[model samples]
Target: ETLGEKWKARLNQMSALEFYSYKKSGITEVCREEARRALKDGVATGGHAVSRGSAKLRWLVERGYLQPYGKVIDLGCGRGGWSYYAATIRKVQEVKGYTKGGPGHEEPMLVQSYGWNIVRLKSGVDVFHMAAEPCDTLLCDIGESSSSPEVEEARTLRVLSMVGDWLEKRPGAFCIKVLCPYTSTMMETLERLQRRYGGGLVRVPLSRNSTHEMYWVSGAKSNTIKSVSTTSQLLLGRMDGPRRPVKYEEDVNLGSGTRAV
Candidate 1:
């Protein structure tokens, strides 16, 4: 069986919480879903995890990082849960909904409700928060461990692009959320990003009631974003352990990524 298929099979007897985390651990759908059944009732599992009184999500709202005055965005606004929570509970001004809307799964209700001019497009994420598309906060809850390596790389690069888009438009410290994994490769890539962007990248593990997604609350230091080349993007992702600060090459531009010295 494929990676995702095997994962599905494994998750068939597990609870929703278990299944989701299990798949997230590395069962790539592209590489492997065997139509695995949920361990317990899937709804019961999600309902249990996502109570209206979730301290984790609620803490995000009370922090002022969420519920910004004017505009807010939930990038991978899956089924509008985050958007609904932001709007109904936190009361953020405007919530835009988007996901890599594929085929029949497009959410017309979200499009109409949020007044999102753009949806169901791959390139939308490329310019996520550019000048023409500025928002007070950006919520990107994209899933990781995709089976297709190309798609995985694309997703990772798109994150930098999206962050770059935000810095250009928003400037000051904006609260951004990211998912960190338990792998050294992801950690190394994150550290490199912190070095280039000069942001406060700290780990915030989820509470017991919540899922296994680890959050990183990041702060952008400036609006000047220097794009990292595709090779460099992969290079950082390829790194898989603690590292020392790399010496800068003063002679050449290196054409990798630029930072504000």
Candidate 2:
């Protein structure tokens, strides 16, 4: 069955709370209904749901990378959950949404913009050929995993370096959905990003249907944010464990404008 079909079947059996146990910001009863309607209306999964994407976005917000009244760019924005959340909840000034080539499914129900304008872009001739101005916040969920974990790490590093270069050297945030395999390249890439910006790891909790291991790495304040969340420390190699999940500590109290997860 297709991924959406599988999610439809699984979602039917699971409660919203049960489904979004790991991180509880998204996946509400409303989110469930929307997913069901998307199935009926022939909307594609497009690799992101409001529940999944909003949860990740909130994770960034709670940690304090994202702020209000600033330009945000959602690179490789799948289906449009991340951009939607930023425009609605975070109340950013402008949101630029880009994908490989718009939706590969039926016409999307999600509006390109809600509170603010969301300029949509597609990968026509070349993927990274589109010109992008440095924004206040840069959110990227780009790059795919190769067959091998080591290969995926290398590809992720390359894309991350490219993304890092795209970021403006000003006060803002840089968040990327990445897969780190407890490898040397992953460690090096993350450290390089840390050196360039200020912030640390926001690890991904285990998800049901997720194949590749993932983490939402974030760095805020080009020089230094007003309020910092993650501590800056040289990330060593991997943890001593079987799976070797990236060890992350959560920030208990976000300043004002924090959402309960």
Candidate lDDT values, in order: 0.38, 0.48
lDDT of 1 by residue, 1-261 (tens): 322233223334456765444332311111001111221224212122122112344445555434433455666554554454444332355556565555544332221222223222232332344343676656665545444434544565566556656556652333444432223354456566566545543222222211223333443232211211221222222232333232221111111111121
TM-score of model number 2: 0.59
Position 161, candidate 1: lDDT: 56
Report the CA-based lDDT of candidate 1 relative to the real structure.
Answer: 0.38
Model 2, residue 129: distance off in Å is: 2.7
Q: What is the lDDT of residue 240 in candidate 1?
A: 27
Model 2 CA lDDT for position 215: 44
TM-score of each: 0.44, 0.59
User: Using alpha carbons, what is the TM-score of model 1?
Assistant: 0.44
RMSD of 2: 11.4
Clashes (N, CA, C under 3 Å) per candidate: 6, 0
Q: Best lDDT goes to which candidate?
A: 2
